Amino acid sequence: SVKGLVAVITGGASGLGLATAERLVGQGASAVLLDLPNSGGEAQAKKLGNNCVFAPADVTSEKDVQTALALAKGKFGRVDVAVNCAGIAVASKTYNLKKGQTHTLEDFQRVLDVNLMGTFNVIRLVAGEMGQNEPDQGGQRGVIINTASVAAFEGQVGQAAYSASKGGIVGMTLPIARDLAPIGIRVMTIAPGLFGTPLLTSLPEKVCNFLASQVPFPSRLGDPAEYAHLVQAIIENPFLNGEVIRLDGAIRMQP
Amino acid sequence: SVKGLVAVITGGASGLGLATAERLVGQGASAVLLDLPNSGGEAQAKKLGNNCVFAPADVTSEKDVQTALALAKGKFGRVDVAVNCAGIAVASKTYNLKKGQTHTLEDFQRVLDVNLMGTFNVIRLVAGEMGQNEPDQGGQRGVIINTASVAAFEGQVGQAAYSASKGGIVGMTLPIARDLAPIGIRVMTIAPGLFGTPLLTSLPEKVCNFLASQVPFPSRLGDPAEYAHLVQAIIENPFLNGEVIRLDGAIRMQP
Amino acid sequence: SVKGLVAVITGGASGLGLATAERLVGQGASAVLLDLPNSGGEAQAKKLGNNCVFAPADVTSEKDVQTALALAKGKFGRVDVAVNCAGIAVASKTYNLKKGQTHTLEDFQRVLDVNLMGTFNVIRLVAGEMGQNEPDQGGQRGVIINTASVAAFEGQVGQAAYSASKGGIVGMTLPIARDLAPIGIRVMTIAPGLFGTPLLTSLPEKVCNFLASQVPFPSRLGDPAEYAHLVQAIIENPFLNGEVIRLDGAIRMQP
Amino acid sequence: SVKGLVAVITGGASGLGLATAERLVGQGASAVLLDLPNSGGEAQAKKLGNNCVFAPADVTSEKDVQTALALAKGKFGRVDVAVNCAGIAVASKTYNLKKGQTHTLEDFQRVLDVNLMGTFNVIRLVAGEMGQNEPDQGGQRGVIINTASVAAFEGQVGQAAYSASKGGIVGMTLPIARDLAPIGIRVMTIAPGLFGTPLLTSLPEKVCNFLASQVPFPSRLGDPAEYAHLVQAIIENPFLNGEVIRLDGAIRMQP
Amino acid sequence: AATREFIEMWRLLGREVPEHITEEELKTLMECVSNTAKKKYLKYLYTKEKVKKARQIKKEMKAAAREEAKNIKKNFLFLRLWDRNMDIAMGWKGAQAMQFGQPLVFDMAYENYMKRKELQNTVSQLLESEGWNRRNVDPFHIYFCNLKIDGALHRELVKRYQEKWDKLLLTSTEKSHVDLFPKDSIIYLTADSPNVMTTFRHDKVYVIGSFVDKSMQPGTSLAKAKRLNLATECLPLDKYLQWEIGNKNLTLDQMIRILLCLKNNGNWQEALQFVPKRKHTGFL
RNA sequence: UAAAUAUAGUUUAAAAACAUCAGAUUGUGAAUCUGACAACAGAGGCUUACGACCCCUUAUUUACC
Ligand SMILES: *O[C@H]1[C@@H](O)[C@H](n2cnc3c(=O)[nH]c(N)nc32)O[C@@H]1COP(=O)(O)OP(=O)(O)OP(=O)(O)O
Ligand SMILES: C[S@@+](CC[C@H](N)C(=O)[O-])C[C@H]1O[C@@H](n2cnc3c(N)ncnc32)[C@H](O)[C@@H]1O
Q1: Contact residues for C57 (Cβ-Cβ < 8 A; gap 6+)
Q2: Would you say D48 and D22 are in contact if contact means Cβ atoms under 8 Å apart?
Q3: Is B touching E (3+ C-beta pairs, cut-off 8 A)?
Q4: B192 vs B150: CA distance, rounded Å
Q5: Which of A62, A163, C191, C254 could be bridged to C148 by S-S, CB 3.0 to 4.6 A?
Q6: How far is residue C218's CA from residue C241's CA, in Å, rounded to a whole number?
Q7: Which of C173, C87, C187, C178 has its CA nearest to residue C130?
């Protein structure tokens, strides 16, 4: 069970992160929202009750994450689960011959820092906090859950920047799991497909309807609550480690 | 939730299948053990109580599976979950030049018949039973869970026959998921590796202890109860479809 | 180089197998066509010249293959390359609710026998003859190339039988390579997409045009000669072993 | 054939890049070595003859690559092949509880800029150069070959940063291939295992010999010349697109 | 009503009046202010029935022939589900088009200059124009601008598409094209434009007026393109084609097909094939 | 200005053929099924009607010594 566990959810002020916080808090766990100051996470933290707090920090900054982790220690005393959900995306082709447009390097860099570098920054810093924890009956010190995407396996046109960052998370899932295996920290990656999140809401409403209808079953956008349910299952299952789970309804994205 | 659901657990007399039956029955669901007449599954069914029944049948044969499905229909009235755990393993090298020994085609056919052909026989027959179920609020008529192996991706020496059968399950999980998507049936596959089943425990104690230490974390053989927990999570999660989940503790088998 | 090597091309009377024979024979190698008696293998062998011979055999039967391989030894004296191109294609939905039709077990069984079981029958028998070869400067006794398909990764609707058989080839490609690594035999697998084989070209030109456009680039059906080129590259590359190569033009089959 | 083709090989002053340049130049092609000023690539270009030139540039910077590509345009008039072999590796655990050492963010960023950002920087910039090329009889404008690593699938301990950068390349291989498919540029990725590059041969014989013995077959470090052979096959084959080719001798890494 | 018998007597006169007419068609005949308008409208209804009945007689013949033939009277890789597959494939391309495709704008501000006969035809060509875009290798990002929700054009489009209207992969809005794209990147195509278009620029947005002027109204689009400071262009029909017969205002389906070929690197030889052959005596 | 012409998906000839839209999980004639749309430049007239016949507008192509 997740009763009594302390969870540090990155980007927990909205989208998948907020849904994960709601379920874990409702199940007796304690959540620490870790999002940007302007994300409005303070209001969400108050709504979720006294078991949830808001940590204003930027994932790409080592100092900011350390302050957020220090805040989690003061309020709850320990960190047991880390969920990486913060991410950004850009819809730009690598090169457009007709328009003579080339993908901006800054756009590629920006996605990398938040999606990939930001995920590693939390993983390495949060793992240090989890090291202080004493092993339980199973010898586990903590659980780290990363949020990849189906784009890491098959990405659409113009998703090179987003795919590259999510591809890195998938590639580095097992090496980090092996790295932290001696200290008993489990690393897992969830590759959600089309979910009702602000990342996919930016697309035209008619695009969203078609993409939702293309899911074999269920033929709808992934509910963020479903993502939270899978997160809880990974936490409860001790034998899930170093694996990428695709939560997308068996949809393969054509170009 | 799984309360009230009727599950037809293939190979439920012992090993992973029995562990799945124990959890589902204890959670309020109804189980229908489907194994060989000599497997002793009726004794196990009696232990689990009234909610569990034993249906002696052979997966490789159409006639017996149909009778087993009919028994489930008569006893409970419907089938909601199908779990495929029946299978056999053969440890024979493809060709040993030193001994001049060639892998026998009979061993390869037998492994395919039970692990691969038997799995498809249950899927196609059990699918018809779920086709009669009225769609639920989510439009789902049932769920099918398969039991692949880590050998499908990282196979060892002498596991060619086992890998081929489990490779087919991984290959055919998505085509069947697309096939049954209009009906509203979710097809999922689990690829457990090095679990505490009788088969693995039968091997030399010196060897099994070594393998138990090769798992990065937890450094132990997979608990069949843990496999049952993942089965329940797949059933409860509506968005898990057409995916292979590796439940092995981040272990990549070696030559 | 491929000059002087003796190649046993399974299913070499037409399709991909025939195209492989033309290139290897045209490059100085010797080919041994292994197809069914009803096929026009005898005519093709005569056309290819004195360096090509036809061995009528059924892959699913051990005796047929043994005689065919013995024929190669008598005519040429050794076997250096094996190409598994023989197979059958069956399309059938797992279960149709509206039609009330269930997939026939015989259809599934026969596809497995030829595509999967037949391929293994050749692999385990050719390795015996490749085991008699003296290792070359690189310590290699022979090369075995299998013909998987993109259906092994994302099969379409009604391709459950085809995907399962091809998935087994992809699953067991690495275990066999590990089995035969001490002997010195390299095992490789190719997974072509849509190729202009006689089976594919028989469809209406309206269907063929749509299939051609499905390939991102090049937007055309795969030339059988292109498949032969990769076969030569695998033979000429000593470091290609236990890997699956998709010759499909970056296409991902939709449902 | 590769006769008369112009290839831009990043990191071509030594290692795999130099081997590719040697084979392509010896086969009639013209190569443009794109490496750092201190790599000593000017001498290598002189050795390869008047058909090879050295363009000092840093892949991480847009300005340097553009000047290098301008040099290639002036010297040869067009760019037909782009081989991305530039890259560096770092060895450092994510977190060391025993030593209380945390993977500093500097190295993870450093590897990402060179291996991941540098690869994308060349891909987008060179794609403009290939865009000006007239389509050939096959409609192809150019071929882009990326150098991933086997660590992108099963990385070792301390290779989290290296795996993430190489994992990204695998992720964006298909999205870029789909992006450039209308243009007519083939994007392919090679995932070499352990090769006899100067960096690998610098390690002590105690570890170098052990790694050589871990390859099933051939049981030796990959010859860089063999990597060039695979590169030529990808260039010549028109149907190879959007795939990751593992050139490692069927070896899977242990933790 | 006095109009009902007005028709029945015309039936006795044999005024090419159909046999069965719905009350909905009767009020349309009511709007006809002139007898010739009533005469013209009734003939359209008459031929409407004649084609349907001839269609039906030739239709039941098909069923009768097929069943008779049936009474007298392997290995596959794909199931015969192609028609579904193409629709999905086009949908995926269409979704990509609205994220990266070149915007093509259909202006729906001409509803005030169209009768019911021409308004119906405009929708027919709009359906075909969008149909060819879907099947194209590189579809445009079709924009339906100035499309009032309660307007006749919007209502007619809904009936012809039924439930498919909300699933079409195109942008339909009430805002003018000037409010969606920069005014310097908009080219209002029109046959009356003094400027002749020579090269198809991929960085520009082309506006096609969804206007079918059976009753010729020259300069209607030019005035719209001149009220707002928007550039205008015309196809080089006279430059390349030996125009001899007909009007130079091509249909919407032909217009989009011409642009589609140009956008796919096609030259004027291929692009201008879609112009009706009856209009011109060859190419040069 | 005058004389011949004008098919709003495209041709044919004086009503058809090929296309278009919606629905289809199609067992490989779907090579089909059930629907949608069928206006020979436009408008106004004449006549029991006629696509005839007669004015008017726009447009196209020629001629304007
Ligand atoms: O009526 C014509 C015509 O008298 C004369 N005109 C113009 N072009 C030509 C030509 O090529 N060949 C001949 N024989 N005559 C030509 O000028 C008049 C032009 O008519 P417009 O209506 O265009 O001129 P305006 O704007 O002044 O109005 P209107 O009062 O004459 O009708
Ligand atoms: C058949 S035209 C009718 C409207 C006509 N422009 C008018 O004012 O009377 C319909 C649309 O097709 C386009 N179009 C028709 N012919 C054209 C041509 N020759 N050159 C450029 N555009 C043309 C125009 O943009 C116009 O908006």
Answers
A1: C34, C35, C36, C64, C65, C67, C68
A2: yes
A3: no
A4: 6
A5: C191
A6: 27
A7: C187
Note whether D254 contacts B: Cβ–Cβ < 8 A.
Answer: yes
Report the distance from CA of residue D135 to the C1' of nucleotide F11 in Å, as an integer. 36
Q: Which residue of D has its CA nearest to B155?
A: D252
* Experimental method, per PDB record: cryo-EM
Q: Is B37 on the interface with A (CB under 8 A)?
A: no
Search chain E and give the residue with CA nearest C210.
E86
As a rounded value in angstroms, the CA-to-C1' distance for A91 and F20 is: 34
Contact D117, D125 (CB under 8 A): no
The CA distance from C7 to C52, in Å, is 9
Q: What residues in D contact B255, CB-CB < 8 Å?
A: 216
D133 phi/psi in degrees, rounded to 5: -70, 140
Tell me if residue B195 falls in helix, strand or coil.
Answer: strand
Residues of C in contact with B241 (CB under 8 A): none
Decide if B152 contacts B171 (C-beta within 8 A): no
- What is the C-alpha separation between A154 and C153, in angstroms, rounded? 12
Smallest-distance ligand from the CA of E221: 2
E161 touches strand F (CB under 7 A): yes
Q: Which two tokens stand for residue B44?
A: 């196990």
State in words which class domain A1-247 has: alpha beta
Dihedral in degrees, nearest 10, Cα atoms E210, E214, E217, E220: 0
H or E element in which residue A96 lies? strand A95-96
Q: Which residue's alpha carbon is nearest to atom 4 within ligand 2?
A: E211
Burial label, B187 (beta-carbon count in 10 A; 0-12, 13-18, 19+): buried
Whether CB of E11 is under 7 Å from strand F: the answer is no
C-alpha of residue E208 to centroid of ligand 2, in Å: 7
For the Cβ of E248 lying below 6 angstroms from any atom of ligand 2, the answer is yes
Cis peptide before D238 (omega within 30 of 0): no
| Inter-chain residue contact A175 with D157, CB threshold 8 Å | yes
Distance CA C248, CA C149 (A): 9
Between CA A155 and CA A159 the distance in angstroms is 6
Indicate if CB(E127) is under 7 A from strand F: yes
The tokens for B1 are 């939730």
Task: Name the phi and psi angles at B196, rounded to 5.
Answer: -80, 45
Integer Cα distance of D94 and D161 in angstroms: 9
| DSSP code of residue D116 | I
Q: Are A94 and A38 in contact (CB under 8 A)?
A: no
Helices vs strands, H then E, count in chain E: 10, 8
Closest CA to D232 of D138, D128, D143: D143
Cα distance between residue B188 and residue B185, in whole Å = 10
Distance (Å) from the alpha carbon of B83 to chain A's nearest alpha carbon: 18
Q: Which whole-number Å values give the CA distances from A219 to A210, A214, B139, C91, E170, in the listed order?
A: 10, 7, 10, 24, 21
**Cis peptide bond N-terminal to D218, omega within 30:** yes
DSSP element (H, E) containing B65: helix B62-76
Question: Angle of helix B41-48 relative to helix B16-26, nearest 10 degrees?
Answer: 20
Q: What is the rounded distance in angstroms from the CA atom of residue C21 to the CA atom of residue C5?
A: 12
DSSP for E160-202, please give it: HHGGGGGG-SSEE-SS-GGGTS-GGGEEEE-TT-SSBP-S--T
Please calculate the CA angle E12-E14-E17 and round it to the nearest 5 degrees. Answer: 100
Which among D83, D81, D178 is positioned nearest to D130, based on CA atoms? D81
Chain C neighbors (3+ CB pairs < 8 Å):
A, B, D, E
Mutant choice from D156, D252, D254 vs B, greatest count of B C-beta within 10 A: D252
- Between the CA of residue D193 and those of A24, C110, D148, what are the distances in Å? 42, 38, 9
| Residue D223: DSSP 8-state | P
